[PDB]
Design an enzyme around this catalytic site. Structure first.
Site, PDB file in Angstrom:
ATOM      1  N   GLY C  10       0.807  -1.208   0.000  1.00  0.00           N
ATOM      2  CA  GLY C  10       0.000   0.000   0.000  1.00  0.00           C
ATOM      3  C   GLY C  10       0.842   1.261   0.000  1.00  0.00           C
ATOM      4  O   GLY C  10       2.066   1.192   0.088  1.00  0.00           O
ATOM      5  N   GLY C 143      -5.335   1.982   5.884  1.00  0.00           N
ATOM      6  CA  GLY C 143      -5.624   1.829   4.470  1.00  0.00           C
ATOM      7  C   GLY C 143      -6.300   0.513   4.145  1.00  0.00           C
ATOM      8  O   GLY C 143      -6.135  -0.475   4.863  1.00  0.00           O
ATOM      9  N   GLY C 144      -7.062   0.498   3.056  1.00  0.00           N
ATOM     10  CA  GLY C 144      -7.756  -0.704   2.632  1.00  0.00           C
ATOM     11  C   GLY C 144      -6.790  -1.788   2.198  1.00  0.00           C
ATOM     12  O   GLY C 144      -7.020  -2.974   2.433  1.00  0.00           O
ATOM     13  N   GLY C 146      -3.270  -1.661   2.944  1.00  0.00           N
ATOM     14  CA  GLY C 146      -2.380  -1.859   4.073  1.00  0.00           C
ATOM     15  C   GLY C 146      -2.962  -2.790   5.119  1.00  0.00           C
ATOM     16  O   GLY C 146      -2.244  -3.595   5.707  1.00  0.00           O
ATOM     17  N   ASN C 206       1.645   7.644  13.799  1.00  0.00           N
ATOM     18  CA  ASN C 206       1.843   8.811  12.939  1.00  0.00           C
ATOM     19  C   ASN C 206       1.739  10.126  13.703  1.00  0.00           C
ATOM     20  O   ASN C 206       2.447  11.087  13.404  1.00  0.00           O
ATOM     21  CB  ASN C 206       0.839   8.810  11.783  1.00  0.00           C
ATOM     22  CG  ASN C 206       1.455   8.344  10.479  1.00  0.00           C
ATOM     23  OD1 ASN C 206       2.673   8.210  10.368  1.00  0.00           O
ATOM     24  ND2 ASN C 206       0.615   8.107   9.477  1.00  0.00           N
ATOM     25  N   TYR C 224       4.305  13.647   4.514  1.00  0.00           N
ATOM     26  CA  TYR C 224       4.691  12.241   4.526  1.00  0.00           C
ATOM     27  C   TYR C 224       6.194  12.097   4.324  1.00  0.00           C
ATOM     28  O   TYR C 224       6.826  11.212   4.898  1.00  0.00           O
ATOM     29  CB  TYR C 224       3.944  11.464   3.442  1.00  0.00           C
ATOM     30  CG  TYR C 224       2.499  11.156   3.769  1.00  0.00           C
ATOM     31  CD1 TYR C 224       2.106  10.840   5.064  1.00  0.00           C
ATOM     32  CD2 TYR C 224       1.529  11.174   2.776  1.00  0.00           C
ATOM     33  CE1 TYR C 224       0.784  10.554   5.358  1.00  0.00           C
ATOM     34  CE2 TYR C 224       0.213  10.893   3.060  1.00  0.00           C
ATOM     35  CZ  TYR C 224      -0.158  10.585   4.348  1.00  0.00           C
ATOM     36  OH  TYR C 224      -1.477  10.303   4.616  1.00  0.00           O
ATOM     37  N   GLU C 254      18.544 -11.511  18.567  1.00  0.00           N
ATOM     38  CA  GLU C 254      18.927 -11.539  19.973  1.00  0.00           C
ATOM     39  C   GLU C 254      17.963 -10.708  20.813  1.00  0.00           C
ATOM     40  O   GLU C 254      17.439 -11.181  21.822  1.00  0.00           O
ATOM     41  CB  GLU C 254      20.356 -11.025  20.153  1.00  0.00           C
ATOM     42  CG  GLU C 254      21.436 -11.980  19.665  1.00  0.00           C
ATOM     43  CD  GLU C 254      21.605 -13.184  20.573  1.00  0.00           C
ATOM     44  OE1 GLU C 254      22.545 -13.976  20.346  1.00  0.00           O
ATOM     45  OE2 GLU C 254      20.799 -13.338  21.516  1.00  0.00           O
TER      46      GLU C 254
HETATM   47  N1  LIG Z   1       3.910   7.671   7.826  1.00  0.00           N
HETATM   48  C1  LIG Z   1       3.240   7.584   6.681  1.00  0.00           C
HETATM   49  N2  LIG Z   1       1.895   7.291   6.698  1.00  0.00           N
HETATM   50  C2  LIG Z   1       1.205   7.200   5.535  1.00  0.00           C
HETATM   51  C3  LIG Z   1       1.836   7.396   4.316  1.00  0.00           C
HETATM   52  N3  LIG Z   1       0.909   7.239   3.341  1.00  0.00           N
HETATM   53  C4  LIG Z   1      -0.284   6.952   3.914  1.00  0.00           C
HETATM   54  N4  LIG Z   1      -0.114   6.932   5.274  1.00  0.00           N
HETATM   55  C5  LIG Z   1      -1.134   6.641   6.295  1.00  0.00           C
HETATM   56  O1  LIG Z   1      -1.796   5.443   5.949  1.00  0.00           O
HETATM   57  C6  LIG Z   1      -3.183   5.542   6.199  1.00  0.00           C
HETATM   58  C7  LIG Z   1      -3.938   5.375   4.884  1.00  0.00           C
HETATM   59  O2  LIG Z   1      -3.568   4.156   4.285  1.00  0.00           O
HETATM   60  P1  LIG Z   1      -2.802   4.052   2.875  1.00  0.00           P
HETATM   61  O3  LIG Z   1      -1.498   3.311   3.010  1.00  0.00           O
HETATM   62  O4  LIG Z   1      -2.578   5.409   2.258  1.00  0.00           O
HETATM   63  O5  LIG Z   1      -3.886   3.254   1.988  1.00  0.00           O
HETATM   64  P2  LIG Z   1      -3.520   1.952   1.121  1.00  0.00           P
HETATM   65  O6  LIG Z   1      -2.642   0.993   1.890  1.00  0.00           O
HETATM   66  O7  LIG Z   1      -2.828   2.372  -0.151  1.00  0.00           O
HETATM   67  O8  LIG Z   1      -4.933   1.234   0.823  1.00  0.00           O
HETATM   68  P3  LIG Z   1      -6.037   1.795  -0.218  1.00  0.00           P
HETATM   69  O9  LIG Z   1      -5.552   3.079  -0.851  1.00  0.00           O
HETATM   70  O10 LIG Z   1      -7.337   2.024   0.512  1.00  0.00           O
HETATM   71  O11 LIG Z   1      -6.265   0.752  -1.288  1.00  0.00           O
HETATM   72  C8  LIG Z   1      -3.425   6.917   6.782  1.00  0.00           C
HETATM   73  O12 LIG Z   1      -3.435   6.784   8.185  1.00  0.00           O
HETATM   74  C9  LIG Z   1      -2.214   7.706   6.345  1.00  0.00           C
HETATM   75  O13 LIG Z   1      -1.903   8.720   7.270  1.00  0.00           O
HETATM   76  C10 LIG Z   1       3.193   7.693   4.290  1.00  0.00           C
HETATM   77  O14 LIG Z   1       3.776   7.871   3.220  1.00  0.00           O
HETATM   78  N5  LIG Z   1       3.888   7.781   5.477  1.00  0.00           N
END
Ligand SMILES: Nc1nc2c(ncn2[C@@H]2O[C@H](COP(=O)(O)OP(=O)(O)OP(=O)(O)O)[C@@H](O)[C@H]2O)c(=O)[nH]1
Ligand SMILES: C=C1C[C@@H]2CC[C@@]34C[C@H]5O[C@H]6[C@@H](O3)[C@H]3O[C@H](CC[C@@H]3O[C@H]6[C@H]5O4)CC(=O)C[C@@H]3[C@@H](OC)[C@@H](C[C@H](O)CN)O[C@H]3C[C@H]3O[C@@H](CC[C@@H]1O2)C[C@@H](C)C3=C
Ligand SMILES: Nc1nc2c(ncn2[C@@H]2O[C@H](COP(=O)(O)OP(=O)(O)O)[C@@H](O)[C@H]2O)c(=O)[nH]1
Ligand SMILES: [Ca+2]
Ligand SMILES: [Ca+2]
Ligand SMILES: [Mg+2]
EC number: 3.6.5.-
Lengths: 67, 424, 440
Positions: C10, C143-144, C146, C206, C224, C254
């Site tokens: 993701g 994220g969906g 993630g 975050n 980000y 360890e």
């Molecule tokens: N630290 C950090 N958090 C991130 C970043 N990109 C997205 N997030 C966090 O991830 C969450 C959203 O999930 P994403 O990873 O963007 O979504 P995804 O995994 O791509 O899943 P979908 O887009 O729904 O298919 C939110 O809480 C964001 O703040 C990043 O580059 N760095």
């Protein structure tokens, strides 16, 4: 002691195979249940729309009869 | 790419639809000939969302124009950016609807709908990965209201898992006196509740009040109203049209905005209404009732969800602080059982004319005031069973009128239910 | 041997992966084209950096990594970016339609269409390993993809690789940079599903990273890019023991033995110092004692919680740079007598210390000052459970009304999966309570 040593190694193997087996089965059943559910929701939706088509027919049919 | 298919039906539908394309075409730097002459690469980043790229570096709007009469689409073809539309995408009849919902949805509209579906199908099959559909129409007239809602059901039947989005213009006696409009609106809302994923409630009553009481222009025109509509439509689609993280597509927007399937009617807002405004000023105005495109006082209800969109070069720190400040000092008006229900987007590129602006998208329980206004006008006629021969003569019976009424009454009560709900 | 395969899932997982692998290249002197002049053995080797990098006959050093997203726009930036020559095209996997912030779509509807392809690509990486150690999985909770796709992958990986170790770097949601109202749903769902399949998971809050960037780096509105570069330094410190070698080095496995007393109690609290701007690090040499002391300042934690109000089950110090055991031991002695450090009665109270001689590096144009020494503390504290409690509360507020649940049910899920996931989180909270109680 030789036999106990064989049992321990065999028990470690079995519990690892069983962990793989259970995870595999749980994933298979989840995928199948989810597939059934989602298709059932689509089927219901389409069926409701089909009912509207049928109703529209009764409307147009009801118009020519009234004329 | 994730394409959107645009459909505009009826006079109002094609009117505000054409203004939409005129406005965003200018933002994405494409002329009436379909050629690009912009200054930023951000303009072409996601242009495939609304535009098809033909050979010769031509950009053609993925748009379908529909009506039961040839007149409206003639003025569209003759109007600016008229020649940019695909000629074959013009689908129109000769009979007309005559402000009759039944003719649009069951009779005349049904005879033309297959021809429209053929075009929708051609456009959809050419999409790398179709997002869904957006429809522009009024609920007062017969074609946009009747045939428009028919098109939604038909499209949904062939594309069950795509997002269906509409820009619906609600009728108002201050603007139109066609009289049978409350009927067409209620019958439409009956359809929208069941078959749309998200609907922007463009209220002609709110548009008139803004032009008269705020913009201080007596005897406002449809040009004035549609100026607000085009400004609103540009704002609520900004996140779809430019590079962004929040609500960048239709389904993600729906997931953030719609907690319950039936409660998907949104209150749109815009600021400033037309020195430049500060962020605190932008923020306070956008949450103000006088800036709502739907005639509903948000302080008469509670927000389930909200999407905010700031445009222009500004301090994101200022934005975050002000958005937090608004929720903190107005916590009573936000439902506690939906944590962090207000999302914010910031796009560097401002709309035309303005240095910076803000667009509001609210799912407020106060939207029930709009439906109550329609329902009261509906029952005023229906209790007398007046003017029902227009519809019964097309094959409809009183059964459908009653069901449409009660379903809209259910929607109202459902908003009140979640408005009264508490955490403890 | 002892290779580690990284999987980035993701947007969050992918972009954080970009930051880590760029940092890795700079630490090991690997150019954007993958060449490494200092590496005299061509075509392969047994060096420490080989745990994370494979080699071609043409002298290219390639990350043992796979990038996967259900949409293309994020990974496309990798495909056409500065380090595009670093990755083989098949290491970068993308679909067309994303999970739309919906666990159900990520784990089921959209995920199932690409899972086999992903597993095939991972298998190709694994076949290049002479002694594969395990997997490092980067992803968000909210994220969906993630949440949903990660769970699917972790389950599938358990089946295809048995109990081979799987470590997580999980991005815990914060309102300052969140993009979905249903992130608490996705978080509880993925945590439940993954809990049995992960051996050790490092949660990154975050909001905690956001505040550290504002406070310590004086960044008004962290992006980000800001967050990821900080996260990368922390991830680098954690994997430094695997990628480098030294007389005072202690492997991550360890620390893991000490960090995981029971299978479900595998969520270490990370703390990192020093985080400081170049402007403030100038003329300001930060000693071992000072950065060690900062590790017990809650404001420097990767997750917001109060360890001073919990109990320790383990405490590990991962130093890198100019550091000698003498100064470390002196600093620890002071901290023990001036800090609120309470251990459970069933574990030893000593601090596990590891030192990597290679000093921290920073990416050009970065925010972090280049320092002579840095430390990452990995502690197993009961206070980590506070992070579960906050998520669980937001979950309960929405689920009591079934808000947004129709989005999940529409994709084939059942409410039973929600209540089941929530119950598991309840049991996890209880587990963390029980391990803290004194022995009878
Ligand atoms: N630290 C950090 N958090 C991130 C970043 N990109 C997205 N997030 C966090 O991830 C969450 C959203 O999930 P994403 O990873 O963007 O979504 P995804 O995994 O791509 O899943 P979908 O887009 O729904 O298919 C939110 O809480 C964001 O703040 C990043 O580059 N760095
Ligand atoms: C007339 C005309 C002719 C033409 C009608 C256009 C149109 C568009 C379509 O929607 C429908 C409407 O308009 C329908 O309009 C109705 C006929 C069918 C027609 O039928 C359809 C179609 O015709 C007529 C009206 O409703 C005109 C309104 C009526 O206020 C109630 C009148 C005071 C009333 O006389 C006192 N009781 O002020 C008028 C106020 C409105 O003027 C218009 C301009 C004048 C108006 O453009 C601008 C809007 C933005 C507005 C503010
Ligand atoms: N804001 C706005 N409203 C319009 C416009 N044209 C028509 N309407 C409204 O739409 C309603 C009539 O619907 P109409 O589109 O004319 O009928 P249709 O052709 O059958 O869809 C009336 O209440 C008008 O106030 C327009 O250009 N702008
Ligand atoms: Ca080598
Ligand atoms: Ca400052
Ligand atoms: Mg994504």
């Amino acid at each position: 002691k030789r036999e106990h040593e064989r049992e321990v190694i065999q028990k470690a193997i079995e519990e690892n195979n069983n962990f793989i087996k259970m995870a595999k089965e749980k994933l298979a059943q989840k995928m199948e249940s989810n597939k059934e559910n989602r298709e059932a929701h689509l089927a219901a939706m389409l069926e409701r729309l089909q009912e509207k088509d049928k109703h529209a027919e009764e409307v147009r049919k009801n118009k020519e009869l009234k004329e | 790419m994730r394409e959107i298919v645009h459909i505009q039906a009826g006079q109002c539908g094609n009117q505000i639809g054409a203004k939409f394309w005129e406005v965003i075409s200018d933002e994405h730097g494409i002329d009436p000939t379909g050629s690009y002459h912009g200054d930023s690469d951000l303009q072409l980043e996601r242009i495939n969302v609304y535009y098809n790229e033909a050979t010769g570096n031509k950009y053609v709007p993925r748009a379908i124009l529909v009506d039961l009469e040839p007149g409206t689409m003639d003025s569209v073809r003759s109007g600016p950016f008229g020649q940019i539309f695909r000629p074959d995408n013009f689908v129109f009849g000769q009979s007309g609807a005559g402000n009759n919902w039944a003719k649009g949805h069951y009779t005349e509209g049904a005879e033309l709908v297959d021809s429209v579906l053929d075009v929708v199908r051609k456009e959809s099959e050419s999409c790398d990965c179709l997002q869904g559909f957006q429809l522009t129409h009024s609920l007062g007239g017969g074609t946009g209201s009747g045939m428009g809602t028919l098109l939604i059901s038909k499209i949904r039947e062939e594309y069950p898992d795509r997002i269906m989005n509409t820009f619906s213009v609600m009728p108002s006696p201050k603007v139109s006196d066609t009289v049978v409009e409350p009927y067409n609106a209620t019958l439409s809302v009956h359809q929208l509740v069941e078959n749309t994923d998200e609907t922007y409630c463009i209220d002609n009553e709110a548009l008139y009040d803004i032009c008269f009481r705020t913009l201080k222009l007596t005897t406002p025109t449809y040009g004035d109203l549609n100026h607000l509509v085009s400004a609103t439509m540009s704002g609520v689609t900004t996140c779809l049209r430019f590079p962004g993280q929040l609500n960048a597509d239709l389904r993600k927007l729906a997931v953030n905005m719609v907690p319950f399937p039936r409660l998907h009617f949104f209150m749109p807002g815009f600021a400033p209404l037309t020195r430049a405004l500060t962020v605190p000023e932008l923020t306070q105005q956008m949450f103000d009732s006088k800036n709502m495109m739907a005639a509903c006082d948000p302080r008469h209800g509670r927000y389930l969800t909200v999407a905010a969109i700031f445009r222009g070069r500004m301090s994101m720190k200022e934005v975050d602080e002000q958005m937090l400040n608004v929720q903190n000092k107005n916590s009573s008006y936000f439902v506690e059982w939906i944590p962090n229900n207000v999302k914010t987007a910031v796009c560097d590129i401002p709309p035309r004319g303005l240095k910076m602006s803000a667009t509001f998208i609210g799912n407020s329980t106060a939207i029930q005031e709009l439906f109550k206004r329609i329902s009261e006008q509906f029952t005023a006629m229906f209790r007398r069973k007046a003017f029902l021969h227009w519809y019964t003569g097309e094959g409809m019976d009183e059964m459908e009128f009653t069901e449409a009424e009660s379903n809209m009454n259910d929607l109202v009560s459902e908003y009140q239910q979640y408005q009264d709900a508490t955490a403890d | 041997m002892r290779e580690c395969i990284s999987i980035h899932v993701g947007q969050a997982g992918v972009q954080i992966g970009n930051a880590c692998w760029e940092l890795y290249c700079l630490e090991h002197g690997i150019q954007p084209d993958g060449q490494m002049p200092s590496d005299k053995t061509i075509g392969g080797g047994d060096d420490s950096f080989n745990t994370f990098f494979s080699e071609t006959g043409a002298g290219k050093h390639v990350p043992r990594a796979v990038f996967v997203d259900l949409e293309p726009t994020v990974i496309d930036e990798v495909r056409t970016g500065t380090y595009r020559q670093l990755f083989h095209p098949e290491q970068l996997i993308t679909g067309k339609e994303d999970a739309a912030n919906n666990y159900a779509r990520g784990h089921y509807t959209i995920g199932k269409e690409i899972i086999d392809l992903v597993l095939d690509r991972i298998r190709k990486l694994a076949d290049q390993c002479t002694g594969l150690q395990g997997f490092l999985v980067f992803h968000s909770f909210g994220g969906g993809t993630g949440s949903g796709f990660t769970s699917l992958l972790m389950e599938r990986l358990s089946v295809d690789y048995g109990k081979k170790s799987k470590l997580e770097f999980s991005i815990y949601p914060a309102p300052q940079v969140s993009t979905a109202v249903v992130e608490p749903y996705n978080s509880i769902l993925t945590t439940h599903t993954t809990l049995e399949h992960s051996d050790c998971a490092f949660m990154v809050d975050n909001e905690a990273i956001y505040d550290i960037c504002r406070r310590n780096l004086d960044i008004e509105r962290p992006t980000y890019t800001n967050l990821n570069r900080l996260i990368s330094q922390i991830v680098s410190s954690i994997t430094a023991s695997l990628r480098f070698d030294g007389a005072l080095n202690v492997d991550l496995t360890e620390f893991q033995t000490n960090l995981v007393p029971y299978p479900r109690i595998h969520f270490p609290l990370a703390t990192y110092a020093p985080v400081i701007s170049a402007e403030k690090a100038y003329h300001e040499q930060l000693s071992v004692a000072e950065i060690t002391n900062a590790c017990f300042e809650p404001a420097n934690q990767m997750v917001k919680c109060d360890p001073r109000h919990g109990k320790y089950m383990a405490c590990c110090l991962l130093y890198r740079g100019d550091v000698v055991p003498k100064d470390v031991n002196a600093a620890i002695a002071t901290i023990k007598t001036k800090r609120s450090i309470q251990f459970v009665d069933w574990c030893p109270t000593g601090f596990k210390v590891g030192i990597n001689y290679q000093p921290p590096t920073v990416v050009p144009g970065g925010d972090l000052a280049k320092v002579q020494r840095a430390v990452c503390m990995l502690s197993n504290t009961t206070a980590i459970a506070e992070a579960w409690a906050r998520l669980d509360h937001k979950f309960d507020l929405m689920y009591a009304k079934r808000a947004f649940v129709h989005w999940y049910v529409g994709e084939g899920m059942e409410e039973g999966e929600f209540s089941e996931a929530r119950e598991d989180m309840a049991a996890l909270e209880k587990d963390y309570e029980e391990v803290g109680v004194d022995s009878v």
